[PDB]
Amino acid sequence: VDICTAKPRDIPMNPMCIYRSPEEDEGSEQKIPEATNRRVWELSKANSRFATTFYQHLADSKNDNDNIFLSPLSISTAFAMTKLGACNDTLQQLMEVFKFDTISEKTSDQIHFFFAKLNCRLYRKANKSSKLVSANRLFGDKSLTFNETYQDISELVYGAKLQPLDFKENAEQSRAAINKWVSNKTEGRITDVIPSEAINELTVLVLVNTIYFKGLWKSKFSPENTRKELFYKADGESCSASMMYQEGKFRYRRVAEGTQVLELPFKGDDITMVLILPKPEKSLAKVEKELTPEVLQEWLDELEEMMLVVHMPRFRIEDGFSLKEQLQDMGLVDLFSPEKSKLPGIVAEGRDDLYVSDAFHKAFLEVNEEGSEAAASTAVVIAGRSLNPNRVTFKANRPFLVFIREVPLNTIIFMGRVANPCV
Numbered sequence: 001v002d003i004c005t006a007k008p009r010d011i012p013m014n015p016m017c018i019y020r021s022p023e024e025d026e027g028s029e030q031k032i033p034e035a036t037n038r039r040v041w042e043l044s045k046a047n048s049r050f051a052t053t054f055y056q057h058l059a060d061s062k063n064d065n066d067n068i069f070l071s072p073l074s075i076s077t078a079f080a081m082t083k084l085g086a087c088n089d090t091l092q093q094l095m096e097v098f099k100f101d102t103i104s105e106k107t108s109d110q111i112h113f114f115f116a117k118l119n120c121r122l123y124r125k126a127n128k129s130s131k132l133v134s135a136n137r138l139f140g141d142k143s144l145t146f147n148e149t150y151q152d153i154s155e156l157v158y159g160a161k162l163q164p165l166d167f168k169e170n171a172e173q174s175r176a177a178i179n180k181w182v183s184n185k186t187e188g189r190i191t192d193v194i195p196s197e198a199i200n201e202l203t204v205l206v207l208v209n210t211i212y213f214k215g216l217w218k219s220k221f222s223p224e225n226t227r228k229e230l231f232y233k234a235d236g237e238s239c240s241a242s243m244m245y246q247e248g249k250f251r252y253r254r255v256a257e258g259t260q261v262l263e264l265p266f267k268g269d270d271i272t273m274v275l276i277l278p279k280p281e282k283s284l285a286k287v288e289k290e291l292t293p294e295v296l297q298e299w300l301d302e303l304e305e306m307m308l309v310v311h312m313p314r315f316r317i318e319d320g321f322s323l324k325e326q327l328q329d330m331g332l333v334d335l336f337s338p339e340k341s342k343l344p345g346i347v348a349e350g351r352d353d354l355y356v357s358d359a360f361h362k363a364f365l366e367v368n369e370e371g372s373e374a375a376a377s378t379a380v381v382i383a384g385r386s387l388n389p390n391r392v393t394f395k396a397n398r399p400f401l402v403f404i405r406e407v408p409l410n411t412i413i414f415m416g417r418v419a420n421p422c423v
């Protein structure tokens with residue numbers, strides 16, 4: 001039956017390869033909420049350590065006046081799926097990079113199971129206020145013979161059926177179909193995850209994750225109070241920007257160095273949007289430099305309901321980029337190397353030369369008077385073309401950090417930086 005009601009012994013599944021136990025975060029922090037499996041919560045902490053760390057590298061590789069938008073959950077889910085077929089040093093690297101080894105022995109050895117559990121809690125909860133769904137998938141070459149266990153564990157644990165496409169002969173048309181499926185799952189918001197020419201004739205498998213969020217604000221903004229105003233980019237140019245207005249009671253706190261932290265709850269209170277604004281003339285860099293899940297937890301736990309005036313733009317951002325460079329810097333070497341990569345659990349027919357050529361991410365965010373919409377997707381390509389993509393996106397001034405979190409479980413669904421609010 002269900003992995004949602006099941007327990008480890010119910011579904012005997014343990015993957016092919018297993019990682020060693022290192023030479024237990026000393027002094028467990030953040031006591032778990034009620035009716036919540038210890039193990040799930042630990043996984044939630046693992047992903048949050050990846051979220052902050054990944055952002056750190058990401059924000060370091062862009063101009064400070066750039067927009068950054070991602071869904072670290074999606075990235076984690078997709079790599080965990082990828083992890084199924086990993087072994088030896090490729091698996092250890094994934095384990096460390098994603099923070100999967102920074103938790104207890106049992107949880108560490110049962111990543112996928114707990115991810116299914118954690119996902120059951122995220123998307124399959126009986127008291128929906130806001131919509132939060134997810135869809136996973138495997139797209140593999142039509143002529144190959146994949147490992148049956150691999151399929152089964154991936155369908156059972158992540159809901160990822162395996163769709164056969166003709167990479168070998170119709171490469172270009174396969175990609176489009178993958179993007180069409182991704183567009184479908186994200187309500188036409190993420191239409192182009194995989195970039196032209198990335199998939200080719202030597203392409204074996206494409207692992208995709210999709211996350212979609214749409215929530216109504218708990219305290220709406222009146223459109224008759226929304227107004228226009230010029231926004232001055234760093235360069236010199238300006239653009240129009242519809243700035244919304246509202247007055248009410250909201251969790252807020254003025255922190256160290258004058259940094260303001262504001263919380264905007266979606267109906268239900270299960271999911272909220274946190275905003276982090278540096279002091280008027282203060283750079284975001286320091287805050288971004290000292291961004292650990294501990295510090296974040298401190299800010300949120302200091303917040304005190306207060307009556308205030310909220311001013312925020314009606315906007316839409318979108319980020320699209322490749323994760324190869326960043327992950328490598330962060331420790332993920334083997335997985336992308338055609339000589340050292342070791343993924344022996346994907347294809348039945350002993351073709352053990354696989355390597356992830358490139359992996360793409362793409363997010364979308366829209367904020368308005370009614371609520372907030374967000375979508376995202378990760379696509380990992382096994383054996384295609386490593387291409388060096390888009391090295392230029394608009395630089396604008398005075399950015400704020402945005403976070404779309406799930407409260408009970410403390411999961412960072414979406415996270416980023418809005419520099420250019422003009423649409």
Ligand SMILES: CO[C@H]1O[C@H](COS(=O)(=O)O)[C@@H](O[C@@H]2O[C@@H](C(=O)O)[C@@H](O[C@H]3O[C@H](COS(=O)(=O)O)[C@@H](O[C@@H]4O[C@H](C(=O)O)[C@@H](O[C@H]5O[C@H](COS(=O)(=O)O)[C@@H](OC)[C@H](OC)[C@H]5OS(=O)(=O)O)[C@H](OC)[C@H]4OC)[C@H](OS(=O)(=O)O)[C@H]3OS(=O)(=O)O)[C@H](OC)[C@H]2OS(=O)(=O)O)[C@H](OS(=O)(=O)O)[C@H]1OS(=O)(=O)O
Nearest residue numbers: 007008009010034035036037038039040104105106107117
């Ligand atoms: C070397 O040491 C490490 O490895 C060994 C060997 O493990 S191995 O066999 O994999 O090799 C570990 O030992 C095993 O682990 C035990 C453990 O408790 O983790 C134990 O697991 C099995 O039994 C437990 C308890 O059984 S119970 O039926 O009496 O409860 C079971 O855990 C329970 O799961 C419940 C669950 O349904 O979720 C929890 O309920 C809460 O959460 C639910 C929903 O969660 S979620 O929605 O967030 O996902 C919630 O729903 C309403 C409940 O409502 C309240 C919550 O309960 S509440 O009261 O807290 O609110 C239970 O409480 C939270 C939870 O008990 C702790 C476990 O299920 S699993 O955790 O999902 O896996 C089950 O696993 S099993 O299927 O594999 O059996 C094993 O005994 C059978 C034990 O094996 S042994 O017998 O050989 O020793 C070491 O674990 S430990 O240190 O002993 O804990 C492990 O150490 S470590 O990894 O270094 O920590």
Ligand SMILES: *[C@@H]1O[C@H](CO)[C@@H](O[C@@H]2O[C@H](CO)[C@@H](O[C@@H]3O[C@H](CO)[C@@H](O)[C@H](O)[C@@H]3O)[C@H](O)[C@H]2NC(C)=O)[C@H](O)[C@H]1NC(C)=O
Nearest residue numbers: 013014015016017147148149150153344345347348349350
């Ligand atoms: C297809 O993939 C499956 C994995 O999904 C491959 O089998 C896996 O192989 C390892 C060892 O070869 C198995 O682990 C074993 O677990 C036992 C538990 O008793 C342990 O004692 C052993 O020392 C070892 O660790 C793993 O369980 C296993 N199978 C499953 C169902 O998980 C299989 O080899 C792949 N087939 C092809 C053709 O590639």
Ligand SMILES: *[C@@H]1O[C@H](CO)[C@@H](O[C@@H]2O[C@H](CO)[C@@H](O[C@@H]3O[C@H](CO)[C@@H](O)[C@H](O)[C@@H]3O)[C@H](O)[C@H]2NC(C)=O)[C@H](O)[C@H]1NC(C)=O
Nearest residue numbers: 133135177179180181182183184185186187188189190191
């Ligand atoms: C993305 O894929 C989904 C299918 O997986 C497509 O949604 C499907 O669309 C039809 C209508 O276009 C849905 O049926 C509708 O049912 C409602 C009531 O439930 C009714 O009022 C409508 O007139 C229609 O009968 C169908 O259920 C739905 N499938 C799922 C699984 O949701 C969607 O169109 C796809 N998008 C694109 C662009 O292809």
Ligand SMILES: *[C@@H]1O[C@H](CO)[C@@H](O)[C@H](O)[C@H]1NC(C)=O
Nearest residue numbers: 017018019020087088089342
């Ligand atoms: C590591 O790799 C070799 C083959 O490259 C394999 O024979 C060995 O079993 C692997 N070790 C572990 C612990 O998986």
